[PDB]
Amino acid sequence: KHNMKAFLDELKAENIKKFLYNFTQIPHLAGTEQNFQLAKQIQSQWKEFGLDSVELAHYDVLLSYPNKTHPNYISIINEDGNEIFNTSLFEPPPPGYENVSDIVPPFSAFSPQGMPEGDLVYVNYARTEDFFKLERDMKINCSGKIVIARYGKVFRGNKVKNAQLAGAKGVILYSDPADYFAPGVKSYPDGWNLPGGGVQRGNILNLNGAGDPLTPGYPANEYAYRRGIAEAVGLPSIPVHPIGYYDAQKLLEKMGGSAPPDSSWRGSLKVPYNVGPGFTGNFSTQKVKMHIHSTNEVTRIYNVIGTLRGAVEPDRYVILGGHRDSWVFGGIDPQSGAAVVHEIVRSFGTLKKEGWRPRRTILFASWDAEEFGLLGSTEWAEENSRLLQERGVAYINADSSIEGNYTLRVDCTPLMYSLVYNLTKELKSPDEGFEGKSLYESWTKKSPSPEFSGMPRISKLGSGNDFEVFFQRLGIASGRARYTKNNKFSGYPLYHSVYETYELVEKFYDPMFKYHLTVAQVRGGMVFELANSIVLPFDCRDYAVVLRKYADKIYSISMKHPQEMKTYSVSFDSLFSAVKNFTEIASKFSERLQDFSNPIVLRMMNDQLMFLERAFIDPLGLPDRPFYRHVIYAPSSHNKYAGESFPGIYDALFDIESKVDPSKAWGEVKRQIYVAAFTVQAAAETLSEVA
Amino acid sequence: KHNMKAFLDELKAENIKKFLYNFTQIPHLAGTEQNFQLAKQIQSQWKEFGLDSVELAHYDVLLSYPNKTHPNYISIINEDGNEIFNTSLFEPPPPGYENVSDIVPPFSAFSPQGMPEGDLVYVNYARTEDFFKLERDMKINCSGKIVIARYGKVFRGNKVKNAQLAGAKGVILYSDPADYFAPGVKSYPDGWNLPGGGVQRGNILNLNGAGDPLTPGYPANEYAYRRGIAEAVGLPSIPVHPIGYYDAQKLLEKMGGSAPPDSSWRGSLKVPYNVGPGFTGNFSTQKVKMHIHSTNEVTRIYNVIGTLRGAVEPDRYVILGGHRDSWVFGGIDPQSGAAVVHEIVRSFGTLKKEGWRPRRTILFASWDAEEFGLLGSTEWAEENSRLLQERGVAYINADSSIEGNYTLRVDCTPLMYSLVYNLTKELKSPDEGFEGKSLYESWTKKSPSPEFSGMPRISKLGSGNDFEVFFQRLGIASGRARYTKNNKFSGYPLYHSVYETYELVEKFYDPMFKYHLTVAQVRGGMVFELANSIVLPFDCRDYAVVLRKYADKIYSISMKHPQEMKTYSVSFDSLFSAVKNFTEIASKFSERLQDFSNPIVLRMMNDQLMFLERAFIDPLGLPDRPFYRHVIYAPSSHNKYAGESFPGIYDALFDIESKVDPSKAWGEVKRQIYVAAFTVQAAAETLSEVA
Ligand SMILES: *[C@@H]1O[C@H](CO)[C@@H](O[C@@H]2O[C@H](CO)[C@@H](O[C@@H]3O[C@H](CO)[C@@H](O)[C@H](O[C@H]4O[C@H](CO)[C@@H](O)[C@H](O)[C@@H]4O)[C@@H]3O)[C@H](O)[C@H]2NC(C)=O)[C@H](O)[C@H]1NC(C)=O
Ligand SMILES: *[C@@H]1O[C@H](CO)[C@@H](O[C@@H]2O[C@H](CO)[C@@H](O[C@@H]3O[C@H](CO)[C@@H](O)[C@H](O[C@H]4O[C@H](CO)[C@@H](O)[C@H](O)[C@@H]4O)[C@@H]3O)[C@H](O)[C@H]2NC(C)=O)[C@H](O)[C@H]1NC(C)=O
Ligand SMILES: *[C@@H]1O[C@H](CO)[C@@H](O[C@@H]2O[C@H](CO)[C@@H](O)[C@H](O)[C@H]2NC(C)=O)[C@H](O)[C@H]1NC(C)=O
Ligand SMILES: *[C@@H]1O[C@H](CO)[C@@H](O[C@@H]2O[C@H](CO)[C@@H](O)[C@H](O)[C@H]2NC(C)=O)[C@H](O)[C@H]1NC(C)=O
Ligand SMILES: *[C@@H]1O[C@H](CO)[C@@H](O[C@@H]2O[C@H](CO)[C@@H](O)[C@H](O)[C@H]2NC(C)=O)[C@H](O)[C@H]1NC(C)=O
Ligand SMILES: *[C@@H]1O[C@H](CO)[C@@H](O[C@@H]2O[C@H](CO)[C@@H](O)[C@H](O)[C@H]2NC(C)=O)[C@H](O)[C@H]1NC(C)=O
Ligand SMILES: *[C@@H]1O[C@H](CO)[C@@H](O[C@@H]2O[C@H](CO)[C@@H](O)[C@H](O)[C@H]2NC(C)=O)[C@H](O)[C@H]1NC(C)=O
Ligand SMILES: *[C@@H]1O[C@H](CO)[C@@H](O[C@@H]2O[C@H](CO)[C@@H](O)[C@H](O)[C@H]2NC(C)=O)[C@H](O)[C@H]1NC(C)=O
Ligand SMILES: *[C@@H]1O[C@H](CO)[C@@H](O)[C@H](O)[C@H]1NC(C)=O
Ligand SMILES: *[C@@H]1O[C@H](CO)[C@@H](O)[C@H](O)[C@H]1NC(C)=O
Ligand SMILES: *[C@@H]1O[C@H](CO)[C@@H](O)[C@H](O)[C@H]1NC(C)=O
Ligand SMILES: *[C@@H]1O[C@H](CO)[C@@H](O)[C@H](O)[C@H]1NC(C)=O
Ligand SMILES: *[C@@H]1O[C@H](CO)[C@@H](O)[C@H](O)[C@H]1NC(C)=O
Ligand SMILES: *[C@@H]1O[C@H](CO)[C@@H](O)[C@H](O)[C@H]1NC(C)=O
Ligand SMILES: N[C@@H](CCC(=O)O)C(=O)O
Ligand SMILES: N[C@@H](CCC(=O)O)C(=O)O
Ligand SMILES: N[C@@H](CC(=O)O)C(=O)O
Ligand SMILES: N[C@@H](CC(=O)O)C(=O)O
Ligand SMILES: [Ca+2]
Ligand SMILES: [Ca+2]
Ligand SMILES: [Cl-]
Ligand SMILES: [Cl-]
Ligand SMILES: [Zn+2]
Ligand SMILES: [Zn+2]
Ligand SMILES: [Zn+2]
Ligand SMILES: [Zn+2]
């Protein structure tokens, strides 16, 4: 038989291991020749594997690189202007790679150039609340200071935005052992911890879903009109650079001014974690100087796009997509994901060679430049937006398959919950102590749902990966799944470091490649069901259940201000009414879905299921974020990695007691309630009888 | 048989006559009780006629009415402040209607209140070019003047916008005999001409597709959040009032200052048509004073929505829609259209009673508040946008069926050209001298295509009627057809006057109701084909042909500035490339459409045809006009009634030699070329093989 079991059984841990090794021997930085060569290799193999067509789709997008002959670094400078301490020019390369060329040194992609000199202020994680605590409670002024922040908790682009708005003249990002060194585990290469010389690379843009900073709305094709740099989307206005904890300790140890306000501000280094500004008495005349000479340049990038044409509904697309570009070797990020995609393609191709095709078309993508702002997936979706609009069933992401070895981690639309519960019940758990048990059992035991007793936890989709354009801009049902640790937004210790290698994975994360195999079964299984099930495997009732939970939650936030709700007549009745109607109508649609040989009614009904995620899109977008159009979900305005529910109302209520004109502020809360109630009702009505 | 011939044969001139009489005995002004009663009558009869469901969809929208106890008028005032001449408080009512109550006096809907006093300047038609001629050539300054303009040539809202931007402190609109009095025909009631006391009503908004000024983007439902009046969309900032030519003559006769610049500025009254400012010597101290006390108020409006469920594709919608609200009796506008819709419903219902259903669902609409800004159609489409998005096959408009008795007038998407040529070849001409000939023959003879030798003329869709939201915002293939005169944007003489009655139509326009019947056959026939043809009756090749014509035209406009095109490297090569590709791909799609028993391929192909108009929508909209999203067509920025092709490039090039920063201006031309080439290519690719 050619069924899901046939598909699943053909996947091999040994193949994923071979592919990972193959993808991680040299760096594959976006816009470099080596990453163009890997793209051509993948294109060739996907053809070999049996796909109907495999093309490269290229774009010319803004990237950012250090200057090879003028290196980035930070100094402590004395009053004579002598640089008495300098941060490292590169990470000590790992054993056996000390002669690899073209390892990009640590840098913050898209930093402007500058050489600012000033006094340090330590801002903890540089979160919105950390800056509130500094300015409002401690009365510390960041204007014209160099801010030093530890990595972790939120997307680093939000840190930089926050520092900029606090008036900082530069930002130093560092990895604190508190966040990147697990107690009792050894540093790379003897364990999976971050050494003192390790540094996390990463872009610091605030693109809000725009894609290439120069071409928002349109693909960066060969005739594209580009904004000038001054009008580019999402570039930081102050220099930024990351460092490791050996260098950070040297910068923090001399810090004076005010004590940290509490223990949540102290990391694990042997320093007081004084907030500053500036150094204690003896060193009060010393300053910190940054030297940043990185350049932004328009650079060609290449996506590989593989097609397996559907036998029955070739105009319905199930997409499996993940990126290929890496900061250095990409041992976990992304090649642990890409190796799984490669094996999934191989298995689907094996079935195809025996005469099978999926019912719907499957598209497979190897995205470029994800590390520089989701650029490859976003440009391709801008180019193909009308096709995706009208034909996109689902998008399944495929970055890193592992970030730990503890249990499954799934983020997806409520429309895919039942598909995921059902599939994981049919898969074997790879976990020690659960041999003979289902993945559903071990996942549910290790990651219990807090909201829904007895179920495993499934999180909201945020952003910070390639599903963003498909889900938040276009409204195509999306999901992702990976193995994870027991710090959820911080990354694993070696994240975006030179030390993230094949050996890291083979020695410390997944020696038998059983977690990679489990994740290939989950991702590949989801794609298989989505592409082959006669009725799309979406349960609208799961959306009704979460909508009620999110409505309760947003109402509860507003109800912290009962006087204002009274004064301005702020009612959530419309939103609860719309959610009630969505519940009722979804329940009736489910009955019809059970109760209909008629392919028009079937496809009519499958169209209603497909367009249900689409119904949550508002073509006007969210306030000042035109590329975030989903009304139920958006990346949090304070942390791109986290999803926020009813984001328009949430941002309207955020810090509302601080707004100078409460009448206007509460008016805008009421506007967002109306938009949310309307969109929920309109989405519900897509499920009503069509005539 | 139940075929188109059965449908067509059931339509009766005698029925349309009875319905017109029924719809025109009392005024049906939007937001009044009488128009709510007509809505309920129509709802009842559509049910009686056999539709599956008929509902009222209501909205609470901003309307505008004169103050019943404080009437609008204009004076000439002497230096003592004595009002020595006053304009009329009402039109002399027509014979037999002198005791009808609730005839709204002439007024400009949505004028603000005010009593401005000042000197007159005569601005011809108040077109963009008339103001260029005044300010640039004649050096006349409208700042703080009261402008008097004749009606005609462009939408009156554009006149008012133009006067406002010229700094006028008020606008007087009048009907000149040159534009509203046909030589050798008698005044109402003895002929169809405008009497000296007649006045054209009409709104003066600049909504740019927004709908209700208070709720742009969202339906004005019972929980809607409304903008405050200061932030409302499209309201004029200066008072405006219309008058007839007896009153206009009194205002113009004393005008001094400069002579008219040429004969195109002179109407037919016995006055010099001096441009002013102010009156000649003896009267130099006299001034004009307006008194406007109209109020804007949120008022309930009601659409009637009738459904005839499709037998095979109930989730595909063909819409026949036209308005019901009128300024006074609506003898032509709209009830000549509504009476035709009513008979079309009756005929479709007759077939339904015998067991027939159309293949696709037909929706029938009686829109409210069209006269106040397309409010009823626009709110309903905002409410139902997701359904319309994904299911809307076509919209056929149905305002006035006649505006003359000479020949057919058709405006539609190129996708409907072939449908219209084919249908008109199968219909009998109602024209004297063409008995026994087809409507195609008489139409082609009387209205030859200028662009396409041997074909009849088909015009672009502009706006100023209820198809606007469906076509320019949502991208649903649209069309309209009516009988017309041999002045195309000016209106017929009695347009929006009290004199537009049943008797006007029965006595002077269409005594035998044969033109109404021909138009019922064209509109009803188009709906029938669209709702019943197995393959959607759209020919993508006709789009390819017009796209080339529009590309040539826009390139030719740019080529008036060859030095700048050289200096700024302005190339249209991308747009011509995209049009060439669209031509090639459309030709190949047509072949496949000919060459495929498979309903999935059929519906796959019908979806490609349906979504082809949709592919021209840009979700970012046109510059500062977010509700005009179609990239090929938009209402002209200088005349809402006229369609403009490649509007984004056209507006970028318009008056470009006057821009202060040519580098920036030509940059924006290049941007619009890129947007246009991209959208044309993307539309083409919706017709490629889907996988
Ligand atoms: C969830 O679904 C239900 C449908 O089951 C839907 O109920 C609808 O609610 C609206 C608004 O509350 C009702 O609107 C009424 O409609 C009648 C005409 O049918 C009007 O006469 C009413 O207006 C009068 O009363 C108003 C309210 O006090 C006054 O402000 C107004 O000026 C009038 O005097 C009113 O408009 C509608 O009838 C129902 N439909 C039903 C019950 O079938 C509900 O709106 C849906 N929720 C959302 C968020 O969409
Ligand atoms: C209409 O349809 C045709 C397809 O038939 C389509 O042709 C495409 O044109 C583009 C842009 O002109 C071609 O792009 C080239 O692609 C190759 C890789 O395949 C690149 O190597 C080329 O780039 C080099 O040369 C450039 C131009 O001088 C340099 O600027 C650049 O830096 C590189 O050195 C170039 O990108 C594409 O291959 C074709 N596809 C074909 C012929 O099949 C055309 O674009 C369509 N029109 C529109 C408006 O979309
Ligand atoms: C990764 O695997 C690929 C695919 O086998 C290897 O590329 C092949 O290399 C051989 C030997 O040089 C060539 O003959 C083939 O043409 C290549 N096939 C391709 C590119 O599809 C590649 O060398 C491996 N890389 C590493 C680092 O092991
Ligand atoms: C930090 O790096 C800087 C730059 O290389 C070093 O300063 C340079 O030292 C040389 C030789 O002493 C001088 O000729 C240059 O003028 C210096 N450049 C600048 C910008 O100061 C510095 O010595 C290094 N500091 C440490 C402690 O290693
Ligand atoms: C997940 O599995 C459940 C249990 O098998 C599926 O629910 C059943 O679906 C069939 C077919 O429609 C019904 O006859 C049963 O009554 C359902 N049982 C229930 C609801 O308890 C469910 O459809 C699956 N989810 C998917 C496929 O998305
Ligand atoms: C227009 O025609 C309608 C439909 O026949 C007339 O309305 C009917 O009036 C009769 C007699 O008063 C009532 O018994 C019916 O209930 C009405 N039917 C409806 C409203 O569907 C209406 O009077 C006619 N109007 C004019 C001005 O002739
Ligand atoms: C134009 O209309 C105005 C308003 O009705 C007339 O002016 C009024 O005349 C009466 C009696 O003479 C005065 O008591 C009012 O004070 C006047 N009102 C104003 C605002 O002036 C005027 O007479 C009319 N003019 C003509 C020529 O008919
Ligand atoms: C308008 O009528 C023409 C002529 O009958 C239609 O074109 C024919 O369509 C049939 C069916 O596809 C073909 O076999 C003929 O070869 C066509 N003749 C031509 C192109 O000259 C055309 O399809 C009709 N247009 C519609 C229905 O939109
Ligand atoms: C690298 O640095 C030097 C010194 O400023 C500069 O001249 C060279 O052009 C740089 N390379 C760039 C900016 O790409
Ligand atoms: C912080 O310092 C800057 C620059 O000296 C000053 O202009 C600004 O007002 C200060 N902000 C606060 C909140 O005190
Ligand atoms: C793998 O699992 C073991 C057992 O729980 C654990 O001790 C080890 O830390 C894990 N490795 C990683 C990288 O998480
Ligand atoms: C009509 O005019 C009078 C005089 O200003 C005013 O008091 C009354 O309220 C008006 N009606 C309105 C504004 O609706
Ligand atoms: C027209 O008159 C106004 C008001 O007196 C003046 O401010 C303005 O500059 C004038 N415009 C021109 C173009 O002369
Ligand atoms: C009707 O047609 C006749 C014949 O051409 C023409 O003289 C008359 O003006 C027409 N009536 C109207 C209202 O156009
Ligand atoms: N996944 C990359 C890029 C995320 C983004 O740019 O949104 C990172 O977190 O650094
Ligand atoms: N058809 C009406 C309204 C047009 C509009 O508001 O766009 C008129 O021309 O006056
Ligand atoms: N693993 C994180 C961080 C990254 O990919 O860079 C994510 O999914 O976005
Ligand atoms: N007959 C014109 C004017 C109007 O309807 O008011 C139109 O179609 O828009
Ligand atoms: Ca772009
Ligand atoms: Ca609205
Ligand atoms: Cl992922
Ligand atoms: Cl019309
Ligand atoms: Zn990644
Ligand atoms: Zn990454
Ligand atoms: Zn009308
Ligand atoms: Zn009208």
Side-chain angles (χ1 to χ4, degrees), chain A residues 323 333 370-371 399:
Chain A
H323 78 104
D333 180 15
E370 185 276 351
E371 298 292 7
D399 204 345

Side-chain angles (χ1 to χ4, degrees), chain B residues 62-64 109-112 160-161 164 204-207 211-214 228-238 296 372:
Chain B
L62 194 74
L63 303 183
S64 165
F110 301 100
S111 177
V160 171
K161 177 173 169 250
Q164 256 175 223
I204 50 171
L205 294 174
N206 281 278
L207 286 178
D212 166 46
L214 302 185
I229 205 68
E231 294 69 43
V233 177
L235 282 36
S237 71
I238 56 178
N296 299 322
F372 291 80

